[PDB]
Amino acid sequence: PTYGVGHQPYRVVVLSFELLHAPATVCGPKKSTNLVKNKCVNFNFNGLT
Amino acid sequence: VYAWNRKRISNCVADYSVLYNFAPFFAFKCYGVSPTKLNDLCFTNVYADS
Amino acid sequence: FVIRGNEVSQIAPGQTGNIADYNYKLPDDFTGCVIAWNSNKLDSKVGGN
Ligand SMILES: *[C@@H]1O[C@H](CO)[C@@H](O)[C@H](O)[C@H]1NC(C)=O
């Protein structure tokens, strides 16, 4: 603890993300609405807008 | 700072990775070169202002 | 993991050094996040940790 800063200990967590190629398992809070076909709508599929 | 100390460094082999063992600093800011590659390229004279 | 404060800049794509070449290496096409915080009070001992 008497060491100067920059030599002090630090804790590191690296979050490595895997992009969408498989079906998704980790998805955050966003409620899914009903499916609408045969109409020009905006759509969001697992983060793809 | 009005009389900053300038020292000429020449005719020697430099190892900048030893510099992290000298002073407790976070980063090694550089313009023109990179802190990663400084052991690869080499220079004529190195001037240290303090 | 736990790293010294002057080596956090080694946790990045395209960086080499001691830890970035021997302990933990990140890919150049990394898609993720790096989180670092000071933990001197939790990892510092007056007799040396
Ligand atoms: C600086 O020099 C003193 C006396 O030679 C020595 O005790 C100390 O460990 C040195 N510190 C560094 C960082 O080299």
Curated annotation (Swiss-Prot), chain C:
Residues 4-6 are annotated as: Integrin-binding motif. It comes from the Viruses. Binds to host ACE2. RBD also interacts with the N-linked glycan on 'Asn-90' of ACE2. Cleavage of S generates a polybasic C-terminal sequence on S1 that binds to host Neuropilin-1 (NRP1) and Neuropilin-2 (NRP2) receptors. Interacts with host integrin alpha-5/beta-1 (ITGA5:ITGB1) and with ACE2 in complex with integrin alpha-5/beta-1 (ITGA5:ITGB1). May interact via cytoplasmic c-terminus with M protein. May interact (via N-terminus) with host bilirubin and biliverdin, thereby preventing antibody binding to the SARS-CoV-2 spike NTD via an allosteric mechanism. Attaches the virion to the cell membrane by interacting with host receptor, initiating the infection. The major receptor is host ACE2. When S2/S2' has been cleaved, binding to the receptor triggers direct fusion at the cell membrane. When S2/S2' has not been cleaved, binding to the receptor results in internalization of the virus by endocytosis using host TFRC and GRM2 and leading to fusion of the virion membrane with the host endosomal membrane. Alternatively, may use NRP1/NRP2 and integrin as entry receptors. This is Spike protein S1. The chain holds residues 400 to 448 of 1273 of the full protein.
